[PDB]
Amino acid sequence: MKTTIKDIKTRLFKIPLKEILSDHDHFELITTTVTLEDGSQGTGYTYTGGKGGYSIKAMLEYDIQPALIGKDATQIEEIYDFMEWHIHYVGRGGISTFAMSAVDIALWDLKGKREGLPLWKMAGGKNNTCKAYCGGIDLQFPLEKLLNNICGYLESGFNAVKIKIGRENMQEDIDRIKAVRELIGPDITFMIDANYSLTVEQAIKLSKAVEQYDITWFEEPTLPDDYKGFAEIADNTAIPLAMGENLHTIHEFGYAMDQAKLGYCQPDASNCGGITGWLKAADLITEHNIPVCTHGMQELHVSLVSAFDTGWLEVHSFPIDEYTKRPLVVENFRAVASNEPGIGVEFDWDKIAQYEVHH
Amino acid sequence: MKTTIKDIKTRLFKIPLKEILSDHDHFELITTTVTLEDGSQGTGYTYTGGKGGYSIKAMLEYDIQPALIGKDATQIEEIYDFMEWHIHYVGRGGISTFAMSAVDIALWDLKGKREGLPLWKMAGGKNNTCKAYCGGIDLQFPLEKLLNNICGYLESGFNAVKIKIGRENMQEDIDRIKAVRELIGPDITFMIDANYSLTVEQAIKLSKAVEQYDITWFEEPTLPDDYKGFAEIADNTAIPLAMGENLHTIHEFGYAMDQAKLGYCQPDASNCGGITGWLKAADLITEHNIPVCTHGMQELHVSLVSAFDTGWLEVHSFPIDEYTKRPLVVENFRAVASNEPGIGVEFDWDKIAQYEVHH
Ligand SMILES: [Mg+2]
Ligand SMILES: [Mg+2]
Ligand SMILES: [Mg+2]
Numbered sequence: 001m002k003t004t005i006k007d008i009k010t011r012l013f014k015i016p017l018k019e020i021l022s023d024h025d026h027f028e029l030i031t032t033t034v035t036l037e038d039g040s041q042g043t044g045y046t047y048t049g050g051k052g053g054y055s056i057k058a059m060l061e062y063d064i065q066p067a068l069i070g071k072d073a074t075q076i077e078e079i080y081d082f083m084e085w086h087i088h089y090v091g092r093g094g095i096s097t098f099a100m101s102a103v104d105i106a107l108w109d110l111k112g113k114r115e116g117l118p119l120w121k122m123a124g125g126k127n128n129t130c131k132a133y134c135g136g137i138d139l140q141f142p143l144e145k146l147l148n149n150i151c152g153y154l155e156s157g158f159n160a161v162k163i164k165i166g167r168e169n170m171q172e173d174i175d176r177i178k179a180v181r182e183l184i185g186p187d188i189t190f191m192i193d194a195n196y197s198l199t200v201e202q203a204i205k206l207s208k209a210v211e212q213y214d215i216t217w218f219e220e221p222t223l224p225d226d227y228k229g230f231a232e233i234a235d236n237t238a239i240p241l242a243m244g245e246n247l248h249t250i251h252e253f254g255y256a257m258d259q260a261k262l263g264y265c266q267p268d269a270s271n272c273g274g275i276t277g278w279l280k281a282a283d284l285i286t287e288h289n290i291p292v293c294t295h296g297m298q299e300l301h302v303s304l305v306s307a308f309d310t311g312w313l314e315v316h317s318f319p320i321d322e323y324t325k326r327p328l329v330v331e332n333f334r335a336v337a338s339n340e341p342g343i344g345v346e347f348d349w350d351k352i353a354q355y356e357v358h359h
Numbered sequence: 360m361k362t363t364i365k366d367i368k369t370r371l372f373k374i375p376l377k378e379i380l381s382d383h384d385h386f387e388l389i390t391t392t393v394t395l396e397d398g399s400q401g402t403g404y405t406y407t408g409g410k411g412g413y414s415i416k417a418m419l420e421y422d423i424q425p426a427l428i429g430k431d432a433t434q435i436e437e438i439y440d441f442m443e444w445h446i447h448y449v450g451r452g453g454i455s456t457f458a459m460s461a462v463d464i465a466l467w468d469l470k471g472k473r474e475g476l477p478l479w480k481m482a483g484g485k486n487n488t489c490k491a492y493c494g495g496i497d498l499q500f501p502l503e504k505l506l507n508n509i510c511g512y513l514e515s516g517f518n519a520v521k522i523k524i525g526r527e528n529m530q531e532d533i534d535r536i537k538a539v540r541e542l543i544g545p546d547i548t549f550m551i552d553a554n555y556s557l558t559v560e561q562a563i564k565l566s567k568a569v570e571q572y573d574i575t576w577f578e579e580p581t582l583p584d585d586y587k588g589f590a591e592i593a594d595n596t597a598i599p600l601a602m603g604e605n606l607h608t609i610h611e612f613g614y615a616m617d618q619a620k621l622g623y624c625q626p627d628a629s630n631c632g633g634i635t636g637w638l639k640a641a642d643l644i645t646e647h648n649i650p651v652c653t654h655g656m657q658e659l660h661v662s663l664v665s666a667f668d669t670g671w672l673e674v675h676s677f678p679i680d681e682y683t684k685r686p687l688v689v690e691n692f693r694a695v696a697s698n699e700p701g702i703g704v705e706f707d708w709d710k711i712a713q714y715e716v717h718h
């Protein structure tokens with residue numbers, strides 16, 4: 001077949017962050033390039049916060065890629081289903097959905113270039129721009145630096161921000177949230193993210209203390225595994241709950257929609273099964289009339305948040321867009337998806353070559 | 360410290376099965392050897408069905424082992440907690456709990472040798488032998504071969520057997536189950552395992568058709584992720600449900616105890632977090648007064664099933680014991696745990712050396 005998979009090539013880069021995020025001094029980028037019989041090439045990717053890169057590459061090169069050679073790249077859903085059961089024993093999430101994601105995305109890249117369509121269209125096409133917020137203002141920033149960075153985001157042309165909470169001393173979270181609300185005024189959108197570092201009781205107490213400052217959502221108050229804990233927090237608080245970048249499985253988005261009482265949901269195409277797996281979560285989340293949001297990977301998700309046109313795009317702190325041929329375009333406070341056929345993302349291979357790592 | 364971790368060495372073996380199991384022609388063995396400052400050495404392991412070996416080794420060697428060097432091996436639970444959050448982003452099960460397991464088990468090996476205790480004691484010591492059954496009679500065996508193999512198990516000194524079901528034509532499952540019950544007589548224990556290949560409706564229909572043949576449990580009727588599906592099957596059937604080798608997380612055993620209405624539960628120390636993680640599941644499962652069983656890895660689990668003294672040990676088809684210095688000892692239909700200090704398992708390194716694989 002002309003669309004028969006002929007070669008796959010995965011690469012691992014360790015790319016240094018300019019700022020520490022709390023602790024991360026670099027992120028890992030895994031690119032996967034799929035070449036077809038007719039010479040067509042697509043590239044997908046996934047990423048980590050420093051751990052897993054080698055492990056993902058290893059699963060791709062020894063477990064998955066060998067099995068996919070000779071398959072017909074047009075059969076994306078078939079290939080996705082194949083991968084899910086191929087590595088099931090060592091799957092049901094984890095490293096295995098990161099690896100799946102890199103391949104899937106590549107197949108979708110191929111398809112968009114094949115059909116001359118951009119991903120925001122292929123993914124549902126309801127819109128091509130979306131709401132956007134700057135996330136990941138570090139927990140460990142002193143107040144002054146916190147407020148300054150926020151000034152910087154607003155000044156750069158954003159109208160929405162998210163800060164990290166979950167300090168040992170809760171009064172410090174409260175005071176900071178208060179501080180930020182007063183800096184940004186009443187017309188800026190304000191989220192908080194506790195990186196699943198709180199107990200139900202702690203979360204309930206913090207939320208109840210800050211709902212006066214008009215918080216748009218409370219992200220990952222406690223462990224993402226604790227759906228009933230989420231329900232318990234929701235039942236006792238007036239701030240909508242959000243997750244999750246950490247759910248890796250359509251079944252896990254199932255649990256969350258059934259039990260966790262979310263106001264927002266945040267599937268990450270990099271680790272819940274590429275565009276295929278992401279669309280299943282987006283479809284389910286939409287069935288529940290909850291806004292479809294994303295985490296990380298903004299250069300890719302701008303297309304997918306826009307396609308569904310209900311939620312927010314996180315402008316994440318891992319600056320992957322910076323190493324592409326299109327850094328995130330933001331017009332009038334909204335992120336603008338690209339009309340380039342494929343997934344809308346092309347890697348500046350010359351730039352990242354220095355960060356490639358081996359064996 | 361004399362118990363300071365000084366070196367870790369992980370190795371990957373691809374070991375050929377003599378029979379096909381349905382499809383597997385080999386299994387993977389990952390061994391992990393932890394050496395302490397005072398020269399003390401412990402070895403733990405995990406295993407797969409052919410996929411993941413390289414990926415596990417990669418996570419161990421690039422993500423986990425570097426971080427553990429210099430830690431105090433006596434702080435097992437501390438080290439376990441450390442690993443769980445270290446690789447959280449690419450964890451919550453998957454490859455990451457396999458890797459965790461190999462290390463943990465090694466630390467427990469060290470401790471038993473340090474304290475001069477065998478694992479069945481360290482794990483609770485309620486008993487040192489346990490009920491045992493032969494599992495994994497292949498779906499694809501014709502009836503005659505199926506019955507013969509079962510003859511062979513019984514003749515070898517076992518009093519309990521499990522066969523695979525989940526054929527496309529359900530009448531073939533029914534007929535086979537009937538056939539096996541009639542071969543073995545009324546006094547042999549008989550389980551069935553569908554490898555999560557059925558729908559709730561299918562499972563409910565099959566169970567209802569075979570409960571006359573006195574089935575002890577119905578293992579993994581449908582997807583392990585489908586707890587409510589399990590509940591629905593349980594609610595409409597008289598055969599106790601069992602899983603799961605496929606649950607990798609204490610939270611997932613939580614879901615199962617809360618929702619799935621199991622009669623038996625089957626934590627696998629090789630992939631739910633070593634002996635540390637296994638004991639948490641055993642503790643929880645015991646709180647619910649459900650029999651603590653295991654899947655696979657019989658040379659190790661004989662100690663842990665015995666320690667809790669409620670459930671069944673599966674004599675799995677991956678013959679790992681065969682490559683140790685103590686193949687499974689069975690006395691009077693019961694598996695006998697070893698009094699050797701440590702985990703009770705020592706690898707015949709000379710034997711498996713030929714099966715080692717690299718890069
Ligand atoms: Mg977050
Ligand atoms: Mg509420
Ligand atoms: Mg089984």
Ligand SMILES: [Mg+2]
Pocket residue numbers: 592593594595596597598599
């Ligand atoms: Mg019942």
